[PDB]
Design a protein around this nucleic acid. Structure first.
Ligand SMILES: C[C@H](Cn1cnc2c(N)ncnc21)OCP(=O)(O)N[C@H](CC(=O)O)C(=O)O
Ligand SMILES: [Mn+2]
Ligand SMILES: [Mn+2]
Lengths: 555, 411
DNA sequence: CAGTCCCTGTTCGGGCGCCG
DNA sequence: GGTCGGCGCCCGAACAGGGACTG
C-alpha cells in the first residue's frame, strides 16, 4: 500500500477495550451490487485492502442513495467502535451564515469527490475497521476488507478531515492572503477582489494544489456562474436566500410530523420575518409516542396558516458591508415571543430570527427583552464578530427605572428607542416610602403540611379584618393569598406589611406574567392601584398586627 | 537545554474539556498575531483533534494599556492540578504585605516562556482559536513552555525567581515581594517618590535576566464597611419596623443584639407613617446595639485550609458592598465600592470592576482568590464580562438571586 | 436540633431542522 | 433500508439548592 501525501493522525482506542465484533445485517440485493461495485473500485485505488482470518473484528455496512444522482454512498455502522474509540475535540465550532459574507468581485464554489476516501487513516488503527461484504449467495463466505482511509460512520473522521483539510490549505492561503476560502468540510467557497482574469488562474492553481495531495475537484461540481448553491442557500451578486422550503400538508398530523414542521419553521426564521411556532410547539408537550396522531388546535391552525402565507412571498437577505454599522431591531410578537431583524440599510435584512424561551415561573417583558438582546448579541459575535446597535420598543426612561432599581446586575448595549407598538413597559411601581393616609394591612398566612388546610387574612389600622379558610394549600400559597386579599379589600393606595420572603421576592421583581394563576391575580390587582407600598418584618417577633394576624391564621 | 519538572494531574481526574466561547473580531485578530508570533518562537505548536482536551482563550487590555494580552481560562486545569502548587512547591504568603504603605503589581508572565514544560503534560494545555462566521475550523495549539495563567508556572519558576530576587532582596531587606500567578507584588513603607524608583531598580534588575507594567496599591488605606443604624430624632412605625428587621438580621453576626424593647413599640396595629416616640428602655436598647456593632465579631479568624467566599450586593447609585468570609456570618472583611468605571450606566462593568478589586485585595491579604457569589443572571454575565476584564487571573464564581431583605450592609 | 417539602432554577437526554 | 460531527429549536425528566416548619 502506497503512502498517502497527507500526514496521518495517530488514533488510539480507549484503555482496556478491544475492537468491534458485530455480525453483518441482511442487505438487499440492489444494495449489494452497489457495494461490491464500489469496494472493487476502491481496492484498485488503494483505499481498502483485503484481510484474512487474522483480523478478528467486524462491523456492519450499508449504503444510501446520493441526492440527485445515481451514485451510491458507502456508510459503516461504527456505533460499537465509536464507544471504544478515544475522545476527540471537534474543530467545527459552528455553521457559516451567508449574512457574514462580504461582497467579492469573483466567487467560485467547488466540492471534493469522495472526500473521506482521499485522507489516510492511522496504520495501527486500520485493523479495527474490518467489515464483510455479503455476496449474492448466503453460502458464499463473502469478501472482508479493511479501511485504509477515513471511513464514514466513525466519530473521528469529521474531526480528522477538517483538521487535515485545514493543513493542506494553509500553504495556499499563506501565498494568497487576499483570497477568502470558506472551508466547511470539503465544500470550498472561494472569493476574491482580484480581476476575473487572475481569478480563474488562482482557482486552477488551487485545484492543482489540492490535486497534489489526492483531493479531486470535479468539473461537474464546479460552479462559475451565479446563482451559487452554497450551504443550502442561493447566492446572487447582490442578495441571497434559502433554497426552497417545502412544508408537509398532512390532513392527519402526528407527533413526528410536527417535529419536522417545527424544524423547518425555525430554519425559515433566519430570513423569513414573523415566523411563530409557539402554538405548534404546544402540541409536543406531554406526549410520549412519535407516531401518535394529534389534532391541531384552533390556535395552531391559525399559526400554521400565517406561516404559510409568509412563505408565499419571496424574501432575501443582503451581504455584510463592514464600513456601515450593524443594526438589530426587536418586536414583541405574541406573549412570550419575540422577532428581530439584523440589517445595515433599512429593509435590507442581513438575517432575521426569533426568541421565545420562557425562563422562570415569574417574568416580565423587560426581562424577556434583555434575554433577546443577549441572544442576538452572541449570535452577532459568531457571525460578524461585533455587537450590533439595537432599536428597542422600550422607552429610555422605562429601562432606566428598571435596571437602576433592580437588585440584580443588568445591562443593555448601545441602543435607541423605536416607537413601534406594542411598547415594553412596567405595569406597576412599588413605592419606596410608606404612603401617608393609606390603610395599612398586616397580612399573614399559614397551612398544615398533613391536612393541607390553612388560613389567609389581614388586620388593618382601621380595625378592618378578614380571615379565609383554604383547602389543599401550602404555606407559600397562603402568604401570597393574604397579600391578594389585602389588595382586593383596599383602596387605590395601600400599605401592606408581610413576613413572607417568598411572596415579597416575587412581587418586587415586578412580574407581568406568571405560571401561577394566583400571582396573575395579584398582578392584575397591582395594576389597578395607584400607590402600593410593600414592607417586610420578621415573624414571631411580636411586631404590629403581624403577630395578631399570625395567631389568627395559626390553624 | 533546561530539564523539565515532571507534573501530574490530581489522581483520579482527567484533563479539561471546556468549549471555546465566541470571540469578537478585535480579539481574534489579536490572538492570531500573538499565536503566530508565539509559534515562531517555539512557545506553542499546532496540534490536532487527537487531543481531547481544550481550554478557552480570549484577550484583554490591562488598565490604560494599548497592547492586547493573551489570556487563557485555565481555571478548570488549575482545579485538576491543585495538589501540585500547594503540597510540593507551595509559595509562602507574607503577612506583612498588607501592612505596607504602598504595594505595586508587576506583570512578570513573560518570564515563564523561558522554561520548557513537561512533554507528558502539554496535552492538557490545548486551546482552540475560533474564526468569524466559522470561515475555517478551529485552529488548535498547545504550550511548549510554562503557560501564563496556570498555577503550575509560578511554582516551577519559583526556584528561578528566588535566585533572581536574591541580589535585590539583600540590598533591600525591608521590601516585601510576593508572587501570585503572572504578577509580582512589591510592597514597601518608602516615600511615594523613592518607592517607584526602587520599582524601576527591580525592573532593570529583571530585564538583565530576560524578562514591565505597574499598578499602585495602598493597603494601609483600605477601610471596612460596618453595619450602621440610622440617627433619626423622629421615628415612625415603618422606621422602627425596618430597624427591628435589620437588627434581627444583624443578630446572626452579633449575638448580643436585642430587639425586645423596640418590638414593644410595635404592639398595636398602627399606621406605618405614624410617629412613635421611643421609650426609655427602647432608647437604651438602641444605644447599646450601636455599641455592639462597633465591636469586632467574637471568634473570627482566617483558616488557611478553608476556601474564601465573597458576596456582592448592588446598592444602586454606583454603590456596591461586599463581604469576604469562610464560614457564614464570620466575615473576615467587609467593604463598599463607589464611583467605579461604568457608574450610573453599566452594571456589568461595575460588577466586573468590583470582582477585580475584591480579588486583588484577597491576594494581598491572604494569598487566595475567593469564590464569588454574583448578583446577576448567568447569561447576562457570560455575555459581557470578558469585554471589561483587565486582570491576568480569573476567580471562580457562581450566580445567586437574592431579593433585597432589609438593606443590611448599606444605609 | 436534622428531617422533610414547597418552590424554583439548572442541566441533560432526545426528537426534528440544516450542512458536509 | 436506521452511520458520524457540527450548530439551532422544543420538550420533560432528572438534578440541586435555598426557605420555613417540625420530631
Ligand atoms: C463524507 C463527507 C461528509 N458526509 C456527508 N454526508 C455524510 C453522511 N451521510 N455520513 C457521514 N459523513 C457524511 O462528505 C464527502 P462527499 O462524498 O463529498 N459528500 C456526499 C454527500 C452528498 O452529496 O449527498 C457523501 O459523502 O455522501
Ligand atoms: Mn465532496
Ligand atoms: Mn406566616
Amino acid at each position: 500500500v502506497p503512502i498517502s501525501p497527507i500526514e496521518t493522525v495517530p488514533v488510539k482506542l480507549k484503555p482496556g477495550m478491544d475492537g468491534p465484533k458485530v455480525k453483518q445485517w441482511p442487505l438487499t440485493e440492489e444494495k449489494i451490487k452497489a457495494l461490491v461495485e464500489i469496494c472493487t473500485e476502491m481496492e484498485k485505488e488503494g483505499k481498502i485492502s483485503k484481510i484474512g482470518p487474522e483480523n478478528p473484528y467486524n462491523t456492519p455496512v450499508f449504503a444510501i442513495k446520493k441526492k440527485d444522482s445515481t451514485k451510491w454512498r458507502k456508510l459503516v455502522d461504527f456505533r460499537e467502535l465509536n464507544k471504544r474509540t478515544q475522545d476527540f475535540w471537534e474543530v467545527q465550532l459552528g455553521i457559516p451564515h451567508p449574512a457574514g459574507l462580504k461582497k467579492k468581485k469573483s466567487v467560485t464554489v467547488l466540492d471534493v469527490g469522495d472526500a473521506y476516501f482521499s485522507v489516510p487513516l492511522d496504520e495501527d488503527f486500520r485493523k479495527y475497521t474490518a467489515f464483510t461484504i455479503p455476496s449474492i449467495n448466503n453460502e458464499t463466505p463473502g469478501i472482508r476488507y479493511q479501511y485504509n482511509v477515513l471511513p464514514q460512520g466513525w466519530k473521528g473522521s469529521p474531526a480528522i478531515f477538517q483538521s487535515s483539510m485545514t493543513k493542506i490549505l494553509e500553504p495556499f492561503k499563506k501565498q494568497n492572503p487576499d483570497i477568502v476560502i470558506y472551508q466547511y468540510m470539503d465544500d470550498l467557497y472561494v472569493g476574491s477582489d482580484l480581476e476575473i482574469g487572475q481569478h480563474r488562474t488562482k482557482i486552477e492553481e488551487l485545484r492543482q494544489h489540492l490535486l497534489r495531495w489526492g483531493l479531486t475537484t470535479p468539473d461537474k461540481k464546479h460552479q462559475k456562474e451565479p446563482p451559487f448553491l452554497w450551504m443550502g442557500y442561493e447566492l446572487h451578486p447582490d442578495k441571497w436566500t434559502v433554497q426552497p422550503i417545502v412544508l408537509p400538508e398532512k390532513d392527519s398530523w402526528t407527533v413526528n410530523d410536527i417535529c419536522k414542521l417545527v424544524g423547518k419553521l425555525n430554519w425559515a426564521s433566519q430570513i423569513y420575518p414573523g415566523i411563530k411556532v409557539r402554538q405548534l410547539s404546544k402540541l409536543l408537550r406531554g406526549t410520549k409516542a412519535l407516531t401518535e396522531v394529534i389534532p391541531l388546535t384552533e390556535e395552531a391552525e391559525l399559526e400554521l396558516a400565517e406561516n404559510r402565507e409568509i412563505l408565499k412571498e419571496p424574501v432575501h437577505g443582503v451581504y455584510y458591508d463592514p464600513s456601515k454599522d450593524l443594526i438589530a431591531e426587536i418586536q414583541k410578537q405574541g406573549q412570550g415571543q419575540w422577532t428581530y431583524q439584523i440589517y445595515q440599510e433599512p429593509f435590507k435584512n442581513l438575517k432575521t430570527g426569533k426568541y421565545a424561551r420562557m425562563r422562570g415561573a415569574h417574568t416580565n417583558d423587560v426581562k424577556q427583552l434583555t434575554e433577546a438582546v443577549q441572544k442576538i448579541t452572541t449570535e452577532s459575535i459568531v457571525i460578524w464578530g461585533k455587537t450590533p446597535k439595537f432599536k428597542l420598543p422600550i422607552q429610555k426612561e422605562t429601562w432606566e427605572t428598571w435596571w437602576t432599581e433592580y437588585w440584580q446586575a443588568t445591562w443593555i448595549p448601545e441602543w435607541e428607542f423605536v416607537n413601534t407598538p406594542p411598547l415594553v413597559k412596567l405595569w406597576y411601581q412599588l413605592e419606596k416610602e410608606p404612603i401617608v393616609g393609606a390603610e395599612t394591612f398586616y397580612v399573614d398566612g399559614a397551612a398544615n403540611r398533613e391536612t393541607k388546610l390553612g388560613k389567609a387574612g389581614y388586620v388593618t389600622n382601621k380595625g378592618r379584618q378578614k380571615v379565609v379558610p383554604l383547602t389543599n394549600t401550602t404555606n407559600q400559597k397562603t402568604e401570597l393569598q393574604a397579600i391578594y386579599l389585602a389588595l382586593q379589600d383596599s383602596g387605590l393606595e395601600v400599605n401592606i406589611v408581610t413576613n413572607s420572603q417568598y411572596a415579597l421576592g416575587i412581587i418586587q421583581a415586578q412580574p407581568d406574567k406568571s405560571e401561577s394563576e394566583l400571582v396573575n391575580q395579584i398582578i392584575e390587582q397591582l395594576i389597578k392601584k395607584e400607590k402600593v407600598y410593600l414592607a417586610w418584618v420578621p415573624a414571631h417577633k411580636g411586631i404590629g398586627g403581624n403577630e395578631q394576624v399570625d395567631k389568627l391564621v395559626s390553624a | 537545554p533546561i530539564e523539565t519538572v515532571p507534573v501530574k494531574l490530581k489522581p483520579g481526574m482527567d484533563g479539561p474539556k471546556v468549549k471555546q466561547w465566541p470571540l469578537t473580531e478585535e480579539k481574534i485578530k489579536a490572538l492570531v498575531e500573538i499565536c503566530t508570533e508565539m509559534e515562531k518562537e517555539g512557545k506553542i505548536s499546532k496540534i490536532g483533534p487527537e487531543n481531547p482536551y481544550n481550554t478557552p482563550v480570549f484577550a484583554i487590555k490591562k488598565k490604560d494599556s494599548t497592547k492586547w494580552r493573551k489570556l487563557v481560562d485555565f481555571r478548570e486545569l488549575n482545579k485538576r492540578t491543585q495538589d501540585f502548587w500547594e503540597v510540593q512547591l507551595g509559595i509562602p504568603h507574607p503577612a506583612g504585605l498588607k501592612k505596607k504603605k504602598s504595594v505595586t503589581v508587576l506583570d512578570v508572565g513573560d518570564a515563564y516562556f523561558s522554561v520548557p514544560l513537561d512533554e507528558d503534560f502539554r496535552k492538557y494545555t490545548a486551546f482552540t482559536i475560533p474564526s468569524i462566521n466559522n470561515e475555517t475550523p478551529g485552529i488548535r495549539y498547545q504550550y511548549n513552555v510554562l503557560p501564563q495563567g496556570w498555577k503550575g508556572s509560578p511554582a516551577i519558576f519559583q526556584s528561578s525567581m528566588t535566585k533572581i530576587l536574591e541580589p535585590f532582596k539583600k540590598q533591600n531587606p525591608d521590601i516585601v515581594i510576593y508572587q501570585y500567578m503572572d504578577d509580582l507584588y512589591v510592597g514597601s513603607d518608602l516615600e511615594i517618590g523613592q518607592h517607584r524608583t526602587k520599582i524601576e531598580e527591580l525592573r532593570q534588575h529583571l530585564l538583565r535576566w530576560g524578562l514591565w507594567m505597574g499598578y499602585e496599591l495602598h493597603p494601609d488605606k483600605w477601610t471596612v464597611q460596618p453595619i450602621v443604624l440610622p440617627e433619626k430624632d423622629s421615628w415612625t412605625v415603618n422606621d422602627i419596623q425596618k430597624l427591628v428587621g435589620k437588627l434581627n438580621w444583624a443578630s446572626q453576626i452579633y449575638p448580643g443584639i436585642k430587639v425586645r424593647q423596640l418590638s414593644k413599640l410595635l404592639r398595636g396595629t398602627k399606621a406605618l407613617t405614624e410617629v412613635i416616640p421611643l421609650t426609655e428602655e427602647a432608647e437604651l436598647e438602641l444605644a447599646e446595639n450601636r455599641e455592639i456593632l462597633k465591636e469586632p465579631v467574637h471568634g473570627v479568624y482566617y483558616d488557611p485550609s478553608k476556601d474564601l467566599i465573597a458576596e456582592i450586593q448592588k446598592q444602586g447609585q454606583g454603590q456596591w458592598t461586599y463581604q469576604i468570609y469562610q464560614e457564614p456570618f464570620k466575615n473576615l472583611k467587609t467593604g463598599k465600592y463607589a464611583r467605579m468605571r461604568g457608574a450610573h450606566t453599566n452594571d456589568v462593568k461595575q460588577l466586573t470592576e468590583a470582582v477585580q478589586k475584591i480579588t486583588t485585595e484577597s491576594i494581598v491579604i491572604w494569598g487566595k482568590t475567593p469564590k464569588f457569589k454574583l448578583p446577576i443572571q448567568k447569561e447576562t454575565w457570560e455575555t459581557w464580562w470578558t469585554e471589561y476584564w483587565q486582570a491576568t487571573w480569573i476567580p471562580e464564581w457562581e450566580f445567586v438571586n437574592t431579593p433585597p431583605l432589609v438593606k443590611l450592609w448599606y444605609q
